[PDB]
């Protein structure tokens, strides 16, 4: 049923949230805080979907997107130094792919400001203008807020 597939996804998301919260002690203090924020977004997806304020395709697309960002948090948790440009460029490209995949699956989520932010993210991926400290801070800023903007449809629909 549509109602059974709905209960299936809510069950998946709850098991997913438990798995990662149960590992939060592996994370640095800062990364724990990022995990709490991402799990709040997962809660927003569940409640919006429970209340039929989003459909299953969109909810699952947002879940997939956050799944990737949560795993990247664990990936980065053993990194404290500034990234090489090679590592940085990989990170920017990967995040852009996750954005594009999400918008392909949930095209109602795009906005002018998300499109503009994609372009500013692309411009960071440029070795000639790369400033190891500033470029990384700017990437992390754009990434934090872009995740918030892409998930905003589930916050108070
Ligand atoms: Na949608």
TrEMBL record:
Protein name: Calmodulin-dependent protein kinase
Biological source species: Legionella pneumophila subsp. pneumophila (strain Philadelphia 1 / ATCC 33152 / DSM 7513)
Highest taxon, organism lineage: Bacteria
Gene that specifies this protein: legK2
